[PDB]
Design an enzyme around this catalytic site. Structure first.
Site, short mmCIF file in Angstrom:
data_model
loop_
_atom_site.label_atom_id
_atom_site.label_comp_id
_atom_site.label_asym_id
_atom_site.label_seq_id
_atom_site.Cartn_x
_atom_site.Cartn_y
_atom_site.Cartn_z
N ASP A 140 0.81 -1.21 0.00
CA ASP A 140 0.00 0.00 0.00
C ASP A 140 0.85 1.27 0.00
O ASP A 140 0.51 2.24 0.68
CB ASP A 140 -1.03 0.00 1.16
CG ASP A 140 -2.17 1.00 1.01
OD1 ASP A 140 -2.85 1.28 2.02
OD2 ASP A 140 -2.36 1.53 -0.11
N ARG A 144 -0.25 9.31 0.48
CA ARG A 144 -1.11 9.39 1.67
C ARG A 144 -0.50 8.64 2.86
O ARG A 144 -0.79 9.00 4.00
CB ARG A 144 -2.54 8.87 1.38
CG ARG A 144 -2.63 7.37 1.09
CD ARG A 144 -4.00 6.86 0.68
NE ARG A 144 -3.90 5.46 0.26
CZ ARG A 144 -3.72 5.07 -1.00
NH1 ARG A 144 -3.70 5.96 -1.98
NH2 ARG A 144 -3.57 3.79 -1.29
N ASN A 145 0.36 7.62 2.59
CA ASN A 145 0.98 6.76 3.59
C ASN A 145 2.43 7.13 3.94
O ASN A 145 3.10 6.41 4.68
CB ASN A 145 0.87 5.29 3.18
CG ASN A 145 -0.56 4.82 3.22
OD1 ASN A 145 -1.38 5.33 3.98
ND2 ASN A 145 -0.88 3.83 2.42
N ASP A 158 1.52 3.02 7.74
CA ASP A 158 0.33 2.24 7.39
C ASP A 158 0.70 0.82 6.98
O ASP A 158 0.73 0.46 5.80
CB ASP A 158 -0.59 2.95 6.36
CG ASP A 158 -2.04 2.48 6.37
OD1 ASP A 158 -2.29 1.32 6.78
OD2 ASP A 158 -2.92 3.26 5.95
C1 LIG Z 1 -4.54 11.21 10.02
C2 LIG Z 1 -3.02 11.04 10.05
C3 LIG Z 1 -2.45 10.83 8.64
N1 LIG Z 1 -2.29 12.15 10.71
C4 LIG Z 1 -2.56 13.49 10.60
C5 LIG Z 1 -1.68 14.21 11.36
C6 LIG Z 1 -1.62 15.68 11.53
O1 LIG Z 1 -0.94 16.17 12.42
N2 LIG Z 1 -2.32 16.48 10.69
C7 LIG Z 1 -2.26 17.94 10.79
C8 LIG Z 1 -1.23 18.38 9.73
C9 LIG Z 1 -1.17 19.91 9.66
O2 LIG Z 1 -2.49 20.38 9.35
C10 LIG Z 1 -3.51 20.06 10.32
C11 LIG Z 1 -3.64 18.53 10.49
C12 LIG Z 1 -0.76 13.23 11.96
C13 LIG Z 1 0.34 13.31 12.83
N3 LIG Z 1 0.98 12.21 13.21
C14 LIG Z 1 0.63 11.00 12.79
N4 LIG Z 1 1.40 9.93 13.28
C15 LIG Z 1 1.55 8.67 12.74
C16 LIG Z 1 2.78 8.02 12.89
C17 LIG Z 1 2.91 6.73 12.37
N5 LIG Z 1 1.87 6.17 11.74
C18 LIG Z 1 0.70 6.80 11.62
C19 LIG Z 1 -0.41 6.16 10.87
C20 LIG Z 1 -0.59 4.79 10.61
N6 LIG Z 1 -1.67 4.66 9.88
N7 LIG Z 1 -2.22 5.93 9.65
S1 LIG Z 1 -3.56 6.30 8.72
O3 LIG Z 1 -4.36 5.12 8.79
O4 LIG Z 1 -4.03 7.55 9.22
C21 LIG Z 1 -2.89 6.50 7.03
C22 LIG Z 1 -3.89 6.64 5.88
C23 LIG Z 1 -3.06 7.84 6.32
C24 LIG Z 1 -1.42 6.83 10.25
N8 LIG Z 1 0.54 8.03 12.12
C25 LIG Z 1 -0.49 10.82 11.97
C26 LIG Z 1 -1.20 11.95 11.52
#
Ligand SMILES: CC(C)n1cc(C(=O)NC2CCOCC2)c2cnc(Nc3ccnc(-c4cnn(S(=O)(=O)C5CC5)c4)n3)cc21
Length: 302
Positions: A140, A144-145, A158
């Site tokens: 995947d 986005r990931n 992800d």
């Molecule tokens: C919704 C997600 C994408 N998001 C938005 C963030 C954030 O801080 N956003 C702000 C950025 C500046 O503007 C305002 C929002 C943000 C900050 N930190 C993480 N941290 C991790 C670290 C490692 N793995 C993951 C992880 C694993 N799977 N997924 S998921 O299923 O969501 C994948 C499909 C995307 C995420 N997240 C994830 C974050």
């Protein structure tokens, strides 16, 4: 046959960390912003908390993701900090405060130069080469990931579909037709990821239904050459989309190719107002209670 996986699965107490606000929600689940304050350790770690309703099948899937995510350790891949055992199992991960690379390239287009784009390519190829060393097929890979820790540091995440050796528009033709997944099918998805960056977040094969993709690829149609891309960069993307998987470059070769290009970025990507562009750096004003805050990359073991 295969080596024992001696990774530690850290169980974190609900009381040791707090949710601040929702960062994002969707099909992937819900990701919250938080602070992890371990034991009597005098540290505050900025964290992201993931939970994909209390159902046994959801708990099975997130624990599969936890298994893989706890087993990785590279600067260009996201590692699991721990899990919290509540009714719905939560994944505790590193906060990547700039979010996903896809939204980042759309939102900061006017300030993204050739140096940033080529360096991101090197970093994604480094993370993918590490997963290959670990005999892990992502299945995947997409913009986005890939998450943004800082504009100069990206990581692959992800692991929900990761397996040892449906996003049709990022999939290799063998994957669509025969469900064949390899490191070379990950290379195809890498090529699509690079196309997403070079177009500043364009949707691949936009308006075309997923059911029509396999037929389009069989005819020999590929994603078009992005305006900023020289034939040098596009040719690399095209090699990632070869029918013969063994004819596609290897991640180790993609690190080399993009690194050479990253040494003279303006020769490989043509962007109006390049080098005059500025993105936030950890040496800038108000980039970071504040006291005792430690990033997860500097918080090693208990
Ligand atoms: C919704 C997600 C994408 N998001 C938005 C963030 C954030 O801080 N956003 C702000 C950025 C500046 O503007 C305002 C929002 C943000 C900050 N930190 C993480 N941290 C991790 C670290 C490692 N793995 C993951 C992880 C694993 N799977 N997924 S998921 O299923 O969501 C994948 C499909 C995307 C995420 N997240 C994830 C974050």
């Amino acid at each position: 046959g295969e080596a024992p996986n001696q990774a530690l699965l850290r169980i974190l107490k609900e009381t040791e960390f707090k949710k601040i606000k929702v960062l994002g929600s969707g099909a992937f689940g819900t990701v919250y912003k938080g602070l992890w304050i371990p034991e009597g350790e005098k540290v505050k770690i900025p964290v992201a908390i993931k939970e994909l309703a209390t159902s046994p099948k959801a708990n099975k899937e997130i624990l599969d993701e936890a298994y893989v995510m706890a087993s990785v350790d590279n600067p260009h891949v996201c590692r699991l900090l721990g899990i919290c055992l509540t009714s719905t199992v939560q994944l505790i991960m590193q906060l990547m405060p700039f979010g996903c690379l896809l939204d980042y390239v759309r939102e900061h287009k006017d300030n993204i130069g050739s140096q940033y784009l080529l360096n991101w390519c090197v970093q994604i190829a480094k993370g993918m080469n590490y997963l290959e060393d670990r005999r892990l097929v992502h299945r995947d890979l997409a913009a986005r990931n890939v998450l943004v820790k800082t504009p100069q540091h990206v990581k692959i995440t992800d692991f929900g579909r990761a397996k040892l050796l449906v996003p049709i528009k990022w999939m290799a033709l063998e994957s669509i037709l025969h469900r064949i997944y390899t490191h070379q099918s990950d290379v195809w998805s890498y090529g699509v990821t690079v196309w997403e960056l070079m177009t500043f977040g364009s949707k691949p094969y936009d308006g075309i239904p997923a059911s029509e993709i396999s037929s389009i690829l069989e005819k020999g149609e590929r994603l078009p050459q992005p305006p900023i891309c020289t034939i040098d960069v596009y040719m690399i993307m095209v090699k990632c989309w070869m029918i013969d998987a063994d004819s596609r470059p290897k991640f180790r070769e993609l690190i080399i190719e993009f690194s050479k290009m990253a040494r003279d970025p303006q020769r490989y990507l043509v962007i109006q107002g390049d080098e005059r562009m500025h993105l936030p750096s950890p040496t800038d004003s108000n980039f970071y209670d504040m006291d005792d805050v430690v990033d997860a990359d500097e918080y090693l073991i208990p």
